[PDB]
Write an enzyme that holds these catalytic residues in place. Structure first.
Site, PDB file in Angstrom:
ATOM      1  N   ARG A 229     -32.570  34.674  33.936  1.00  0.00           N
ATOM      2  CA  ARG A 229     -32.370  33.220  33.834  1.00  0.00           C
ATOM      3  C   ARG A 229     -30.883  32.892  33.934  1.00  0.00           C
ATOM      4  O   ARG A 229     -30.501  32.109  34.785  1.00  0.00           O
ATOM      5  CB  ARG A 229     -32.951  32.699  32.521  1.00  0.00           C
ATOM      6  N   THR A 230     -30.058  33.539  33.101  1.00  0.00           N
ATOM      7  CA  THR A 230     -28.590  33.328  33.060  1.00  0.00           C
ATOM      8  C   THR A 230     -27.878  33.750  34.343  1.00  0.00           C
ATOM      9  O   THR A 230     -27.034  33.016  34.849  1.00  0.00           O
ATOM     10  CB  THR A 230     -27.901  34.116  31.887  1.00  0.00           C
TER      11      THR A 230
ATOM     12  N   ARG B 130     -22.060  39.723  30.996  1.00  0.00           N
ATOM     13  CA  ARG B 130     -22.910  39.804  29.829  1.00  0.00           C
ATOM     14  C   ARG B 130     -23.000  41.278  29.424  1.00  0.00           C
ATOM     15  O   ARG B 130     -23.035  42.172  30.279  1.00  0.00           O
ATOM     16  CB  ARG B 130     -24.292  39.194  30.073  1.00  0.00           C
TER      17      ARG B 130
ATOM     18  N   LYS C  83     -19.825  58.373  30.851  1.00  0.00           N
ATOM     19  CA  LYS C  83     -19.737  59.286  29.704  1.00  0.00           C
ATOM     20  C   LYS C  83     -18.273  59.679  29.461  1.00  0.00           C
ATOM     21  O   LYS C  83     -17.734  60.616  30.066  1.00  0.00           O
ATOM     22  CB  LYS C  83     -20.624  60.517  29.920  1.00  0.00           C
TER      23      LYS C  83
ATOM     24  N   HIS D  99     -22.511  33.023  23.214  1.00  0.00           N
ATOM     25  CA  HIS D  99     -23.149  32.744  24.519  1.00  0.00           C
ATOM     26  C   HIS D  99     -22.729  31.349  24.943  1.00  0.00           C
ATOM     27  O   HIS D  99     -23.546  30.450  24.988  1.00  0.00           O
ATOM     28  CB  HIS D  99     -24.669  32.862  24.388  1.00  0.00           C
TER      29      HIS D  99
END
Ligand SMILES: [Zn+2]
Ligand SMILES: [Zn+2]
Lengths: 309, 125, 309, 309, 309, 125
Positions: free
Chosen positions: C54-55, C105, C84, C133
């Protein structure tokens, strides 16, 4: 036409000194004065059968930087391509036919050469297993040129895994097509530069030597190409002993000359200590950034008969 | 007792790694002169004195009983190094676990009681 | 130059009332009279370490709607990055290089702040763990503004999981930077609005009160904000018992003010009934779409000194 | 009472020549005149944190062959154990409680030692990472003993990956506790027997020498120990080149001593050719089976003061 | 016949005080004087549809301890059972018919009751979702009895998650069928003992109270049942604050009475500090071990008309 | 300068967490009497003095210039705590990463610059 117009870019072996020079000179030109419509109305396939984020984004930025569009994928994980029975040949035939150029990366060696025999459109080897990664070498040559003003007559050191490090091999091979670079090899006995690379260097009349430590050669070096010392080719006891000798700290560069630049194809983990970042010699992040301009120039030269800069 | 001839910078490490500041008894320390430590009203064997040898290779250990020296232990490398250093082997079971680190001292090498791998005295520090 | 020019957007707590107003105003012009060249020849990095469709589609739409290009990825599992030993810092430093702004994000709290310290290019926080957010709050405020014709002196109901609902914490906090909002809280006893958020509201001279039901407050409400009341937060017998009184239906809205807009940040399962969709108050899908225009506004102000009409 | 009674079996380095002889002798009686009640009403814990089928079936067969019961698991992924925060120590302490002996294999070096410190019941090391695998060496020595009628004064060839072949390191070390063995080493230059193992052998007045080929030494050899020469340890061009001279065929054995037994710890892919199987020297499958009787012997001596006929 | 002969063991609800007492008394008897042929020629299904290593091994040891055999599985991961369409009912009908008793563990509540209606052979609920785990409570009762010489008139404390902790609920419920235990509840406000448990306690005339800290009640307590404080029912900020109050160290037991025993159904992570292990009060490892004898006694009593001890 | 009135057992922590034993300049420490520290030839602001306040809540900071006291700084809680304590939030980005820990000081609470969560002054130690 420039010498690269419409050519496939498969191996650093089939790119001459003159072509390398033109690529770096073009990178430099494009970085100074971008040409955001060079690839206008051009669609570029970017097919990474094997993930390579830093490379993929580097290419995709370059394409779009020049006004082009991008289609493709970033790992063969998601793809329905080359599943049970279907040839890479067929896959390439279809996808290249969508596009004006074909950037790929693959886990099987020879995969860019095969691609070039089934694409009617130029292909750029973004990497084919342990064989080639030309644009890495090209971005490495550019960064040298940018910071040394030339590619002939340079003292370059290579550190780390010189036995299996393919990035050092192609770079040594590229620089060896130029005049009078003296190479300095600093690596564990167990990862010395391979026999066959060394013969090629003899045949290209190019001085090399082995040194025990980084610090030894620092004051006589212009470029320090660091690579990673991977623990696979050792066990735990070995690594923990052999690592210490090949870690680059701020303390190591105390006797550096001013023009010294530290390169690493990335990622680093601990082979370059954090404290090198702020030192004037660090150029690995700039090197990564120069990936965009190197790939801009190749894409440009491949698809445009001239760069009307 | 009082520990002399300690290298400057490795002497702080003794206080920490050996928890010398733990008892009620008074403790004094001077850094740079070489570091130095004095420990009021506490006993120590010629055995336990040697644990230190790993960090200060050539260091005098004198003892106060009655406002003046009585004995002067000089240190050798002991057989064992019970929980001082972590094992350089990342895979070693020692790591997340409720056990005391331990090395036999062997070319001056340190051999993990647990994983049984062997490390150069320096790599352990 | 607007106050956000060349700024990092990490936290709603660092955005002022004026800035919030500037964002919703800009979001309105770009929605209603679009400006598809505002990011011509700009390349925007969209890096979703943690997957949020959605974002991500929202940002990616916003970017291209403004004439920009997109590079980046949709999750870290499909990546070769932050492997790593490889720091996030190194990864930001490289991908930053590629772009003119960096949207990210990430599963970890503070990742956008860290990013802002290793990027020479403005980062936008697409969500960092349970922390911030901001663009969610920005699309929430824009939707309120757009439908209400103001952000001052509105009656707002917050319904559901107020305790762990990080979206309400910010929306509440944000509207608290304005005048005269009166907040109404409808939740289970176990999911009340945090003590610390209430102190803020008290510091900011804002009325709040708790109510047993949604219906109870509908006659008085301008905006109804539904969050998701998750199953995790109790066991079965508890959820089943508590869910009933926190579901919105069309019948709930029989005494609505004609200007009442129902919001929900999505996704939504049983918490808003299907029969609400057809009603004149449902605005959750319009609100989701307003994600594009809020994120446009923010990208625009971040990269352009001033913005015209 | 035999010296192993109520002892932990963690490391070949803690088992003496007498003890090694006692084990192979016990393993011979239990193989030839079995004693299916030696562990009547004993419950043996078989915990394979790391999956090892050949080994686990071996132990589990040994346990039940002696009248014992088995509890435990085959890997940690199929488990609810050692989860997140949960120590190995706690896990041993609990499962130990259940049993009269604790057999364990684990990915981490030292795990059997740790286990022995949290178990009131004797632990047997089924393999701890790259460290120890005593019962492998014990079945190796038993097989040598059984076929040769001695462990003293045998000619032994070790072939393949001597460098990282933890099985040869122990077998070499073990037979070094005996008299008059002369060792022959056949490996690539990169996979020589460790310097530290050679010092041991020198300390223990034992002849070793390196040879270019297997054939070269066959006339002189009583036991031929083949290990696995893995692909990981070089790149392709290297493996292909080196593999040829380290594969055993039936033709290799044309000048064998009639008492020659070929051993291999398994698994085996191309390193021993199929045509060797039919030959009078192939003993790798018998050796694998001897895993049962070596592990019986060890379990028996561990739990019974004395053992009869 | 004993009262449990041929009975299904589904819930602690349908096991009376007298039956509980007989189970613990039988555990104690079997632990003192094992009966290794009680279940001779009996085959016991042990079907763990949901992994539970500590439980599974506990049961499997008990079965084999009594001379029985075991068939089954340890996670539904490997099984081909109850796949796309097939009922648990059918699965149980088939597998129980192989066997003389049916030990199961399942992630869906009610699954042992359903089993008991499709098995012609007694079923033992090894755990059915958040509903019951009788043998845990039984092993907890046994350990109390063993160390306090009774189950009536005891001061028991319960620490940690008393809201969702099903093991404390059934234990409180079991002990509440006995005389004059006073319970002491030490837990976060947000995880108080549930309303309905407390009513049951009132109805069983059983004193309980709430305390802020472990240390408060220690000198007046005989059994300290520790459970884990899971971070799910909180967030990060909450846990890190609320954890400190409910961790048991050696320092906490300084004013313990001599007969104090610390129980934990395991695993512990940090709710019992390492330094409690060596203290005279720790009984969690013995508690785990007593799982075998509790399950021995149940299996025995279920399948044998009498225990001819 | 010289730092007085330090709690016995928390004074060792100052030397470690603030790397006071790092310069060539002489440094002296006495444990239990309360701990105490003296620092020969080094300067310190009234600003930087306050970083310490977190560990020794009520501790006198005197200064030697010329064999005797010149000034006597008494400590308050500062606004900031740059890399002293790790963030108690396990998920925090701060952890594996090349950054300095940092908290604002707010009921005496510590608020992570990075994750923005807020912890009681004690939970941080
Ligand atoms: Zn170790
Ligand atoms: Zn933090």
């Amino acid at each position: 036409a420039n010498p690269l117009f419409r050519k496939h870019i498969v191996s650093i072996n089939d790119i001459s000194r003159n072509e390398l020079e033109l690529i770096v000179k073009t990178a430099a030109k494009l970085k100074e004065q971008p040409q955001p419509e060079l690839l206008k109305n051009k669609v570029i396939a970017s097919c990474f059968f094997e993930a390579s984020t830093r490379t993929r984004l580097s290419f995709e930025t370059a394409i779009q930087r020049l006004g082009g569009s991008v289609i493709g994928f970033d790992n063969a994980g998601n793809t329905s391509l080359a599943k049970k029975g279907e040839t890479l040949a067929d896959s390439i035939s279809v996808i290249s036919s969508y596009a004006d150029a074909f950037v790929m990366r693959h886990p099987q060696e020879g995969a860019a050469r095969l691609a070039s025999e089934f694409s009617n459109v130029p292909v750029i080897n973004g990497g084919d297993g342990s064989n080639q990664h030309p644009t890495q070498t090209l971005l490495d040559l550019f960064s040298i040129y940018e910071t040394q003003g030339r590619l002939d007559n340079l003292n370059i050191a290579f550190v780390g895994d010189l036995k299996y490090g393919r990035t050092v091999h192609s770079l040594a091979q590229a620089l060896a097509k130029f005049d009078g670079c003296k190479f300095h090899f600093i690596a564990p006995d167990a990862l010395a530069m391979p026999e066959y690379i060394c013969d090629e260097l003899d045949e290209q009349n190019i001085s090399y030597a082995t040194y025990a430590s980084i610090e030894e050669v620092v004051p006589e070096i212009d470029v320090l190409y660091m690579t990673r010392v991977q623990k696979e080719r050792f066990d735990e006891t070995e690594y923990q002993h052999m690592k210490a000798g090949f870690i680059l700290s701020a303390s190591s560069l105390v006797h550096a000359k001013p023009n010294l630049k530290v390169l690493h194809p990335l990622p680093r983990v601990d082979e370059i200590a954090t404290d090198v970042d702020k030192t004037p010699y660090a150029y690995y992040f700039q090197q990564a950034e120069n990936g965009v301009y190197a790939r801009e120039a190749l894409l440009a030269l491949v698809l445009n008969e001239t760069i009307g800069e | 007792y009082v520990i002399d001839h300690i290298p400057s910078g490795q002497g702080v490490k003794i206080l920490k790694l050996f928890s010398l500041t733990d008892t009620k008894q008074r403790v004094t320390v001077g850094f740079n002169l070489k570091d130095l430590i004095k420990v009021e009203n506490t006993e120590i064997t010629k055995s336990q004195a040697n644990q230190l040898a790993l960090l200060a290779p050539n260091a005098t250990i004198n003892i106060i009983e009655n406002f003046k020296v009585t004995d002067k232990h000089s240190l050798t490398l002991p057989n064992e190094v019970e929980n001082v250093f972590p094992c350089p082997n990342s895979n070693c079971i020692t790591h997340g676990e409720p056990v005391t680190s331990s090395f036999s001292i062997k070319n001056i090498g340190l051999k993990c009681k647990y994983c049984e791998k062997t490390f150069s005295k320096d790599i352990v520090t």
